[PDB]
A paper describes a structure:
MakABE are co-expressed with two accessory proteins, MakD and MakC, which are encoded by the same makDCBAE operon, although their functions remain unknown. The structures are very similar with a root mean square deviation (RMSD) of 0.45 Å calculated on 126 Cα-atoms.
Consequently, SeMet labeled MakC was prepared, yielding needle-like crystals. Both the MakC and MakD homodimers are formed by the interaction between identical surfaces in each subunit, head-to-tail, (β5123 pack anti-parallel to the equivalent strands, β5’1′2′3′ of the other subunit). As calculated by PISA, each MakC subunit buries approximately 1,050 Å2 and each subunit of MakD 943 Å2. On the contrary, analysis with MakC antisera revealed that MakC forms large complexes within the bacterial cell, as evidenced by a reduction in the amount of monomeric protein following treatment, which varied with both time and glutaraldehyde concentration.
Numbering used by the authors:
A (entry chain A), B (entry chain A): 1 to 131
Amino acid sequence: MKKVEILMVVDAAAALASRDLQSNIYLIDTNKYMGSGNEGQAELKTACKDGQLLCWRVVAISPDNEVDIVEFNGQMINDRVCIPTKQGLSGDEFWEGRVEAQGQASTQQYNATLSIDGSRLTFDPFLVISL
Amino acid sequence: MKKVEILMVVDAAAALASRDLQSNIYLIDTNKYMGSGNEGQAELKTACKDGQLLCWRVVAISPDNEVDIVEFNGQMINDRVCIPTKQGLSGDEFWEGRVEAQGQASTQQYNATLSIDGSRLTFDPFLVISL
């Protein structure tokens, strides 16, 4: 019944200096999970139940950078398990979509592309879906 | 020479339901530290060197809440070791100030008051200053 809201946090300075997004990103969600990508790809996940609505938004640690989610691609999108769409006002946009598991329960990989002050960088988070 | 930029992340829904800010806040900074207050007061800290400039800003996980830093009080302010001031445009404000340790090095406690959609709630982070 409750939405799962996900905040991606980017260390933008470091992302741009290295061109490595994964090592410079964190996830915090309303499940009270927090993952650092610096500690591994395995940490960049969200837990959710079939039928739940998911909401993503992205922010930078520094006030001087601007960051947006440009696009989602990959497995979760290919198989139509969750197709987020862009919403909100210019300024704080966010992306939302419902999880349509096939009453299966599984892992769904996806590719999120972010624009970090106009630099497009991709990373590979995943969903863990239970029934 | 580099600024230390600090992002406070609030689970606003949960903060307001409990009236407990500490258990529902995270810190991530450009030192690549991440602390959850849910795991204890001891985690809500920032490392810095004497003479360094510190920058704080606050965001909510959800796009539906608005959150601001209202005020800093307590030890760090009393002793004039770091007096942040408010800056930026309406929308993304932030607070900044330089650390003037007495070439001592120490812990400085402070009280940050945040407005969570108009609800004023306080918590007790701290600085760890080295020379």
